[PDB]
């Protein structure tokens, strides 16, 4: 199926060991990023080959090492399925080296390894991640050859640095890292070369491919080029009995759960066979009569009366529907559909059928018409003949990159709850005070998570929770690795960077102290 | 509103109730029986915990706890069931009418005081907590006591006493050859007298249509999913409650029964060793996961610890402009947050101030939500919701906060690369005309779940052993005939303008 090859270039130079007091060294951040990447790759049980090459090591292990070239470069591990051995090597037996090395030589050896090892196996995505400080000398004579080789081999390249393109610094705390003026001339020189090579590789978008260790620890950017694509659901959007547009629907947003499931085993043997689960059906009587499973029948409750309902009878009388139906029931003003009533556990993104021009233009025309008229389509959805029919709303979504329909399920009459709540505006007992209103206004203004950039007169989100990875998976991977490497040891606490990424920037916290105290003093709250 | 709802059906058994002014029209007794059966079915489907009773007065035979003459209590206050529905249906038809006449009789004297007294006694017999005590009088006589004035006075006194006790009485007056006048005698017995309902009624009561309109949707009383704490700061906390204004409806779970006798069967699950066969305590077992050639062993307590970050509740983050909340970023159905004040005092005022200021500034409160212990935290947005009421001053949107879950990075999925193709203005105009041709008004309660309705109808047919289940009407179908008729030739023009002549959009 889908397979990928990844090469991790690790800087172990002396400069990496150097650090400022109170700030974690770049080597530690790179190690954490690599550990997270390997954790996700191995615990996800995905078939992708991973290789690790270290540049700056005291020793030398490289096919191109011979010839007094590419010295102090070692290939820790060639392309192979990730295993706990790589994680163990990262954790303990990979220490910084006192010998500096050129990152361009590291890239060259990585490309050579990719070319040599990628002969007997099929791959569709090659990606190389380079972690350096850019505080060492380098030779630019080989820039053209490496760029040409990258273009010819179609190999993606990513760079991670300890700084990004003044309170205490935190790992993934949504705050500034590596304050300005702390950059020497060597990294300044390296910045232009890395930027131009990335631009040549991709262009302007390549500028976004240079991340930072702290940024990468909370952005899920390492897997951006390795992530797969969900399958497509083909159907026909039909407005009437004649019009029909071939469409493909993908799951734009779906809650992600752990694929692997905990298996119950006996403590003495730690094997599945020892534990056996049995179900016994017995009657409600003093004798405790036992009845066979086949004897059991299905029934339903009818208000204190039990009415038998055999499974075969239910199947015969069950409501029958035609599978794979995407029909437009009607068109209604977008104001008549409210986000409150959205139901379901998924959102569908519907595009035209791949490799189809007439369908593409028809769908584009429909999307443009809906946007211009400010309307949405109430439609009937059915995954297959066995899936229960649903009523949903499809609305246009037009972007410079693409235009597509967005489908979200809508509720039925039986799914609506009518609850009455006493009005708060008309409640004199709970009526607020003008000073309280001013205090709440000040608190809200202080704790704004969006900043108004006057240079472009735009809004920038200081706390983009949508980009934060789910912490549960990271915690599970950390605990599993700790247990595997340390069978006899209590599980470690939550990593600091996880809390930092799950917490708001320190700026709003510091700017909200006085308003919060004002709220506390002006609002008498007594527990009951 | 706490407690059950009790209903008593008072059906007159006089001679006039068995005569129809017109031909081929169901008699008042048959209409009352049909309405009672419909109410029974509606109660069974919606709320089966309510209590319903059926009492007949004016008959010859008597069956009461007080041994009052000419009053028969067919069914005491009890939960509705199929047996009661069948018993009522036994008298539905003309043959059933004759069977009822033979079994009880008719054309016998009665007193409203006695029937009200027995109804009150039946209400007292109930041992649960009743949130509503109601009586329905199915009769077609507007002057039950005209010959004797003492009986009328006693009936009025009993009705007043029942009204003070807390019993709500309604008169489901039926068709009368001379017309029904509520103001004559029943004006002082009805709990609430409507000004409009004062003229002489020459037809059936409008409430009969409402009663006969069966409802097949479960009704759930207001209940808080969880009472949590919103923490603006460590030292600042308020108490709020979370409700599910929208919840998916699932059919009742199947029940295992003994095929031989159709009785409940107890299900027991046991775990035993394959080598010893003895029962295993929870500590005996352990949780293990296999990754390649490596095995990791964790205990249940450790596994629960794995997913644990903070205590249950809502931790308030900074506020965010509502413009940044994408409408297509939907992950889970939203919830409703409303102040509780049952745990911490003074939270209502702070909630109201926050709601007012959020509405004024058009911002949403970003928060970290943890529903229960040992549950990973999620990110939510509380969007202000101002109270909105439709005509007749009836609330349609309660005031509070709308809790919307913001998907994580892992939740989002990348889409395959696509190439944008634009449509010419003529195609856009044609499609706009097509869309306008099918414009319609959408409401949240404009559709019915076909599966649930079909299941309910099949269950009712099986319970009542009807000739055939009532086939439901699938309002979710597109009814392409009307769309075709309205569109006319527009579809052909769009197809010939967009689709090449040789397309065949079928394979």
């Amino acid at each position: 199926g889908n397979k990928a090859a990844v090469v991790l270039c690790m800087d172990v130079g002396f400069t990496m060991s150097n650090s400022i007091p109170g700030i974690e060294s770049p080597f530690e951040q790179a190690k954490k990023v690599i550990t997270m990447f390997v954790q996700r790759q191995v615990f996800a049980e995905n078939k992708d080959e991973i290789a690790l090459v270290l540049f700056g090591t005291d020793g030398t292990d490289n096919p191109l090492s011979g010839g007094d070239q590419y010295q102090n470069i070692t290939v820790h591990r060639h392309l192979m399925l990730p295993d706990f051995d790589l994680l163990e090597d990262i954790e303990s037996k990979i220490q910084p080296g006192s010998q500096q090395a050129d990152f361009l030589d590291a890239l060259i050896v990585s490309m050579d390894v990719i070319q040599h090892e990628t002969i007997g196996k099929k791959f569709e995505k090659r990606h190389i991640e380079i972690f350096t400080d850019l505080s060492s000398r380098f030779s630019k004579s080989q820039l053209d050859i490496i760029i040409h080789s990258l273009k010819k081999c179609d190999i993606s390249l990513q760079f991670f640095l300890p700084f990004s393109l003044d309170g205490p610094f935190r790992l993934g705390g949504h705050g500034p890292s590596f304050p300005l003026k702390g950059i020497t001339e060597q990294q300044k020189e390296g910045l232009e070369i890395v930027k131009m090579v990335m631009i040549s590789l991709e262009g302007e978008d390549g500028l976004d491919e240079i991340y930072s260790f702290s940024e990468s620890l909370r952005k899920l950017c390492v897997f951006k080029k390795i992530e797969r694509h969900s399958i497509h659901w083909p159907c026909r959007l039909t407005i009437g009995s004649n019009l029909s547009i071939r469409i493909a629907a993908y799951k734009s947003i779906l809650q992600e759960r752990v694929k692997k499931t905990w298996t119950v085993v006996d403590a003495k043997t730690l094997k599945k066979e020892d534990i056996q689960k049995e179900t016994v059906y017995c009657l409600n009587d003093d004798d405790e009569t036992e009845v066979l499973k086949e004897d059991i029948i299905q029934g339903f409750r009818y208000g204190s009366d039990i009415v038998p309902f055999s499974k075969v009878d239910e199947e015969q009388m069950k409501y029958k529907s035609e599978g794979k139906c995407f029909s437009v029931l009607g068109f209604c003003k977008s104001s008549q559909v409210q986000r409150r009533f959205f139901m379901g556990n998924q959102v569908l993104k519907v595009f035209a059928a791949r490799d189809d021009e007439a369908a593409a233009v028809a769908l584009s025309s429909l999307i443009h018409a809906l946007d211009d008229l400010d309307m949405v389509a109430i439609v009937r959805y059915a995954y297959d003949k066995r899936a229960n029919p649903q009523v949903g709303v499809a609305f246009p979504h037009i972007k410079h990159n693409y235009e597509c329909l967005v489908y979200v399920q809508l509720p039925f009459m039986e799914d609506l709850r009518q609850y009455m709540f006493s009005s708060l505006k008309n409640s004199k007992k709970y009526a607020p005070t003008e000073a309280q209103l001013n205090a709440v206004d000040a608190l809200i203004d202080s704790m704004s998570l969006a900043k108004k950039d006057e240079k472009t007169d735009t809004l920038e989100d200081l706390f983009p929770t949508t980009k934060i990875p789910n912490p549960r998976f990271q915690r599970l991977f950390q605990c599993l690795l700790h247990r595997a490497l340390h069978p006899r040891e209590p599980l470690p606490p939550i990593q600091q960077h996880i809390w930092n990424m799950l917490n708001p920037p320190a700026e709003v916290t510091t700017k909200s102290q006085i308003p919060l105290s004002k709220i506390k003093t002006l609002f008498p709250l007594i527990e009951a | 509103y706490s407690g059950r709802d009790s209903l008593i059906f008072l059906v007159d058994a006089s001679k006039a109730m068995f005569e129809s002014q017109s031909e081929d029209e169901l008699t008042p007794f048959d209409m009352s029986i049909q309405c009672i059966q419909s109410v029974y079915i509606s109660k069974i489907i919606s709320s089966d915990r309510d209590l319903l009773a059926v009492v007949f007065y004016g008959t010859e035979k008597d069956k009461n706890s007080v041994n009052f003459k000419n009053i028969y209590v067919l069914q005491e206050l009890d939960n509705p069931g199929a047996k009661r529905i069948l018993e009522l249906d036994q008298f539905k038809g003309q043959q059933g009418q004759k069977r009822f006449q033979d079994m009880m009789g008719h054309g016998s004297d009665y007193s409203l005081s006695e029937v009200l007294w027995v109804c009150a006694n039946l209400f007292s017999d109930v041992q649960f907590k009743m949130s509503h005590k109601r009586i329905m009088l199915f009769t077609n006589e507007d002057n039950p006591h005209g010959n004797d004035s003492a009986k009328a006075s006693r009936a009025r006194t009993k009705a007043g006493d029942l009204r003070d006790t807390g019993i709500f009485l309604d008169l489901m007056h039926l068709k009368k050859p001379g017309g029904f006048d509520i103001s004559l005698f029943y004006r002082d017995i009805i709990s609430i007298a409507e000004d409009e309902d004062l003229r002489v009624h020459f037809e059936e009561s409008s409430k009969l249509e409402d009663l006969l309109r069966k409802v097949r949707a479960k009704e759930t009383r207001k209940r808080a999913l969880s009472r949590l704490k919103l923490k603006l700061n460590k030292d600042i906390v308020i108490s709020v409650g979370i409700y599910n204004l929208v919840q998916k409806a699932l059919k009742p779970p199947p029940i295992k029964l003994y095929r031989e006798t159709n009785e409940p069967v107890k299900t027991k699950t046991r775990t035993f060793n394959t080598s010893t066969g003895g029962l295993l305590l929870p500590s005996d077992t352990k949780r293990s996961q296999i990754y390649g050639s490596r095995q990791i062993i964790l205990e249940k307590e450790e596994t629960e610890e794995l997913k644990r970050f903070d205590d249950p509740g809502l931790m308030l983050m900074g506020f965010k402009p509502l413009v940044l909340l994408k409408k297509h970023h939907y992950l889970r159905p939203s919830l409703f947050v409303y102040p509780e004040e049952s745990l911490v005092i003074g939270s209502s005022t702070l909630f109201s101030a926050l709601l007012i200021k959020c509405l004024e500034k058009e911002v949403a409160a970003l928060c970290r939500y943890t529903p229960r212990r040992n549950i990973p935290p999620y990110f939510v947005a509380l969007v202000p919701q101002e109270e909105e009421l439709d005509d007749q001053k009836i609330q349609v949107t309660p005031p509070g906060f709308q809790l919307v879950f913001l998907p994580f990075a892992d939740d989002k999925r990348k889409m395959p690369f696509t190439e944008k193709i634009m449509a010419t203005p003529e195609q856009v105009g044609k499609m706009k005309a097509i869309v306008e041709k099918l414009r319609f008004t959408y409401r949240s309660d404009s559709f019915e779940n076909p599966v649930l309705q079909q299941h309910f109808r099949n269950l009712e047919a099986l319970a009542l052993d009807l000739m055939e289940p009532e086939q439901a009407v699938d309002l979710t179908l597109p009814k392409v005939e009307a769309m075709n008729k309205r569109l006319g030739s527009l579809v052909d023009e769009f197809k010939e303008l967009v689709y090449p002549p040789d397309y065949n959009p079928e394979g």
């Binding site: 009607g330 009518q418 | 109601r134 309109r213 409802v215 007749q392 009836i394 309660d445 309002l475 309205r486």
Partner: peptide, 23 residues
């Protein structure tokens, strides 16, 4: 008070489903 269901007190009488009614 007005519009209250006669079968289930405390719940407004739900309007019967109208499906789709083109204007």
């Amino acid at each position: 008070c007005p519009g209250e269901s006669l079968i289930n007190p405390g719940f407004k009488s739900k309007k019967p489903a109208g499906g789709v009614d083109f204007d």
